[PDB]
DNA sequence: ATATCTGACACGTGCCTGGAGACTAGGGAGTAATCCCCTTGGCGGTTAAAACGCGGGGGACAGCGCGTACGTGCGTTTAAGCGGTGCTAGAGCTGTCTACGACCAATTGAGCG
């Protein structure tokens, strides 16, 4: 991949989703992941 | 009775709208020079203005009759939902060419002879 790492937060994340799977991952980091406690969340 | 629901009620960040600050530099405001203008104002070939004698036809009937109105028949009109599924705008992004910028030639207006 021409560059590496992208950093993202749960607001941006939540509605760009569709841009981000343009793209393919090797690794997920998820960083204060307790943003994820409620599976009613759209996020 | 109980699980768990629908407010209460708030700060998360997104979006764009919307304001004020400090800069350049585009252009607005101040001015003469001077011209050339809107304007004042007499001139006589030409038509507004109103009678008299008069031509073209406006005016008020009688009633014929080629069309006009009602409003129900009856068979042809669009309504109407909701199946599938192609069109359609979003929208993400070029991939340039097309109209709009930067440097300087053919043709014009100004000067007066």
Same mark, same amino acid.
């Given at each position: 991949?021409?560059?590496? %790492? %992208?950093?993202?937060? &749960? !607001?941006? /994340? @939540?509605?760009? /989703?569709? &841009?981000?799977? =343009? %793209? #393919?991952? !090797? &690794?997920? /980091? $998820?960083?204060?992941?307790?943003? $994820? #406690? *409620? *599976? *009613? *969340? @759209? =996020?």
């Amino acid at each position: 991949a021409p560059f590496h %790492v %992208v950093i993202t937060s &749960y !607001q941006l /994340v @939540v509605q760009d /989703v569709k &841009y981000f799977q =343009r %793209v #393919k991952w !090797q &690794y997920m /980091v $998820l960083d204060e992941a307790q943003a $994820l #406690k *409620s *599976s *009613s *969340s @759209v =996020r």
